[PDB]
Design an enzyme around this catalytic site. Sequence first.
Site, short mmCIF file in Angstrom:
data_model
loop_
_atom_site.label_atom_id
_atom_site.label_comp_id
_atom_site.label_asym_id
_atom_site.label_seq_id
_atom_site.Cartn_x
_atom_site.Cartn_y
_atom_site.Cartn_z
N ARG A 150 -3.53 -16.17 -1.70
CA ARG A 150 -3.97 -15.90 -0.34
C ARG A 150 -5.15 -14.94 -0.25
O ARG A 150 -5.81 -14.85 0.78
CB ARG A 150 -2.81 -15.35 0.49
CG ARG A 150 -1.82 -16.41 0.91
CD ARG A 150 -0.76 -15.81 1.80
NE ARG A 150 0.13 -14.92 1.05
CZ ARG A 150 0.85 -13.96 1.60
NH1 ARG A 150 0.78 -13.74 2.91
NH2 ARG A 150 1.64 -13.21 0.84
N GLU A 205 0.80 -1.22 0.00
CA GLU A 205 0.00 0.00 0.00
C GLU A 205 0.84 1.28 0.00
O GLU A 205 0.45 2.27 -0.62
CB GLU A 205 -0.98 0.00 1.17
CG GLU A 205 -2.02 -1.11 1.06
CD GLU A 205 -1.66 -2.34 1.85
OE1 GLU A 205 -0.51 -2.82 1.75
OE2 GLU A 205 -2.54 -2.85 2.57
C1 BST Z 1 13.14 -14.36 5.40
N1 BST Z 1 12.39 -13.21 4.86
C2 BST Z 1 11.15 -12.82 5.56
C3 BST Z 1 9.86 -13.57 5.09
C4 BST Z 1 8.52 -13.05 5.74
N2 BST Z 1 7.79 -14.23 6.23
C5 BST Z 1 7.73 -12.15 4.74
C6 BST Z 1 6.44 -11.50 5.29
O1 BST Z 1 5.84 -11.90 6.29
N3 BST Z 1 5.95 -10.40 4.57
C7 BST Z 1 4.77 -9.54 4.78
C8 BST Z 1 5.21 -8.06 5.11
C9 BST Z 1 4.39 -7.13 4.54
C10 BST Z 1 3.20 -7.44 3.68
N4 BST Z 1 1.97 -6.63 3.94
C11 BST Z 1 1.19 -6.83 5.13
C12 BST Z 1 0.09 -6.13 5.39
C13 BST Z 1 -0.33 -5.06 4.36
N5 BST Z 1 -1.71 -5.44 3.91
O2 BST Z 1 -0.36 -3.79 4.97
N6 BST Z 1 0.46 -4.85 3.15
C14 BST Z 1 1.62 -5.63 2.94
O3 BST Z 1 2.28 -5.44 1.91
O4 BST Z 1 2.73 -8.80 3.80
C15 BST Z 1 3.80 -9.72 3.57
C16 BST Z 1 2.99 -11.02 3.45
O5 BST Z 1 1.99 -11.40 4.00
O6 BST Z 1 3.58 -11.88 2.51
C17 BST Z 1 12.83 -12.51 3.69
N7 BST Z 1 12.11 -11.77 2.92
N8 BST Z 1 14.22 -12.66 3.37
ZN ZN Z 2 1.60 -2.01 6.10
#
Ligand code: BST
Ligand code: ZN
Lengths: 126, 126, 126, 126
Positions: free
Chosen positions: C80, C54
Amino acid sequence: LSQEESTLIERATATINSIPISEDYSVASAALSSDGRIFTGVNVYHFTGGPCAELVVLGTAAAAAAGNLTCIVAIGNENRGILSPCGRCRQVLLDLHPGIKAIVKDSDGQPTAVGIRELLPSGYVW
Amino acid sequence: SQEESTLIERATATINSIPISEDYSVASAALSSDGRIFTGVNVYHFTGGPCAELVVLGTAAAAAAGNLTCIVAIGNENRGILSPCGRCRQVLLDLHPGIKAIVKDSDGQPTAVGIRELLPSGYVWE
Amino acid sequence: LSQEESTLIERATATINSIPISEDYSVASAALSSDGRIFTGVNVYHFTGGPCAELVVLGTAAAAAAGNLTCIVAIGNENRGILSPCGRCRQVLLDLHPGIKAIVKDSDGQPTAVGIRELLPSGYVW
Amino acid sequence: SQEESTLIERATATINSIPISEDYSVASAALSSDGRIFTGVNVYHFTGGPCAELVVLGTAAAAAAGNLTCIVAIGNENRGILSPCGRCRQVLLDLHPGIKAIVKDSDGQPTAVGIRELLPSGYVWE
Ligand SMILES: CN(CC[C@H](N)CC(=O)N[C@H]1C=C[C@H](N2C=C[C@@](N)(O)NC2=O)O[C@@H]1C(=O)O)C(=N)N
Ligand SMILES: [Zn+2]
Ligand SMILES: CN(CC[C@H](N)CC(=O)N[C@H]1C=C[C@H](N2C=C[C@@](N)(O)NC2=O)O[C@@H]1C(=O)O)C(=N)N
Ligand SMILES: CN(CC[C@H](N)CC(=O)N[C@H]1C=C[C@H](N2C=C[C@@](N)(O)NC2=O)O[C@@H]1C(=O)O)C(=N)N
Ligand SMILES: CN(CC[C@H](N)CC(=O)N[C@H]1C=C[C@H](N2C=C[C@@](N)(O)NC2=O)O[C@@H]1C(=O)O)C(=N)N
Ligand SMILES: [As]
Ligand SMILES: [As]
Ligand SMILES: [As]
Ligand SMILES: [As]
Ligand SMILES: [Zn+2]
Ligand SMILES: [Zn+2]
Ligand SMILES: [Zn+2]
């Protein structure tokens, strides 16, 4: 009205009023731990996302192996009183301390403890 | 240096005094111009949870520490000294321009480096 | 059920499914502007607070002098579906686009547009 | 260099194509290995609104741009080239280790500098 509530507000208020007026450090926070301790801290303003007072408090509690935090409040400088936690603070609080309550002001501007989930409806689950 | 070893020792004791955690995995300790030492542990979060160094900045500010002269970060899992991240360098350069950070040199030995040397041609926030 | 709603969801979904599966870029977002345009973007994960999809969308709209944004949604990778905006996103959305609505899932898991203020009760006013 | 001038020209056109704003005051443009150019504008917010460069990273990711080779930031108010902030350097070093950033040299003339040189003894995230 609660003694625990008045005390947290008092500790945070005393913390912010004890330092020089600053635009970088303008808010203090205090949180209560389930093991009988209270941790304080002030915010660090920065465009890259300097931590709000509540996040400094989370790191301070963690440094003392505080464990579970049950309640937290933020008080602004220059006698501004209770400040509601920003959206980022709510997300961090929900993910790291889901059972915590945050003290905010109601319609009548009176202190009230609210569950973190109520401050972040249909919250994103990391 | 005595002051150097002191910060390293303090931060090492800190991270080794809390439960092993993926959320709280680094401790930091800074020295103020007055001689006081401040500590803190990081708070991991994807929205930008504060690095241990930023928690330290807020802890020092809550004590009206004033200017900080040196700071170091120690990682858990016996990782030792961790170089300050890019965001930390920016916040440090903006709030404590004269501060130095302890990092591992070529031989892996601790050394104090000015913040400006860690952020060449740095962006100066207005 | 809305055509505007289905279209935003479709654009965001198509955006995330068009790129390689990544842990760094795992969510896409799409927002509608009052002047008749739709802007998209994907998140950039980083411990220092990499922007959520966002926020990338907000910067993309700004780069096109989009002006006022009326609705925004986020869709996760690997089918998802709709992801609720995190707390930081809500705060930024409230402060920069107070009249915006965010699409989230209700009890029955059905898409629904909600006012930003409802997602951030008693929100902090910067 | 031709590629250098191209990014500078694109970013300059971008910031000069939007209304003067304190929230959206810097534009950035990056070049991908395939030759495509991606742009973006910053989104200011105390919780860590993304710098223009981070918006660019997300825009490129939404287009499956892959690796980025060079990036520059241009400020409004005819400020010209702005050096990437510390947080940006960290994110760039972690997601695009081979990228270079354009900054003003001693004589104030634009030049391309490797990310690693802008973040010596850099922290490498795992
Ligand atoms: C190891 N690692 C980390 C992995 C990690 N599990 C990634 C993760 O949880 N990412 C999340 C971080 C931000 C994103 N997110 C969440 C709420 C939002 N709606 O506001 N908008 C948004 O973009 O959602 C992603 C999502 O659900 O995959 C690496 N990238 N290297
Ligand atoms: Zn956010
Ligand atoms: C020019 N400048 C910027 C000044 C700027 N007006 C400071 C500012 O708005 N700071 C705010 C940023 C964070 C902080 N805040 C907000 C909500 C919270 N409850 O979650 N916890 C918290 O600590 O509240 C501060 C507050 O109200 O003074 C500099 N510092 N150089
Ligand atoms: C799954 N997960 C994420 C685990 C993740 N691997 C944790 C992680 O890498 N944390 C890091 C985030 C910040 C911290 N860090 C880095 C550079 C610094 N010197 O500026 N100061 C600092 O405190 O270093 C931590 C470190 O090395 O363990 C959860 N916590 N839920
Ligand atoms: C009052 N206020 C704040 C005004 C404030 N002075 C805005 C400000 O300084 N913004 C800056 C925040 C980020 C941005 N910046 C910095 C370094 C970078 N190269 O990595 N990339 C980048 O985009 O540079 C902007 C810039 O120089 O105007 C509001 N917007 N409400
Ligand atoms: As309470
Ligand atoms: As030192
Ligand atoms: As809608
Ligand atoms: As170049
Ligand atoms: Zn906050
Ligand atoms: Zn850091
Ligand atoms: Zn930046």
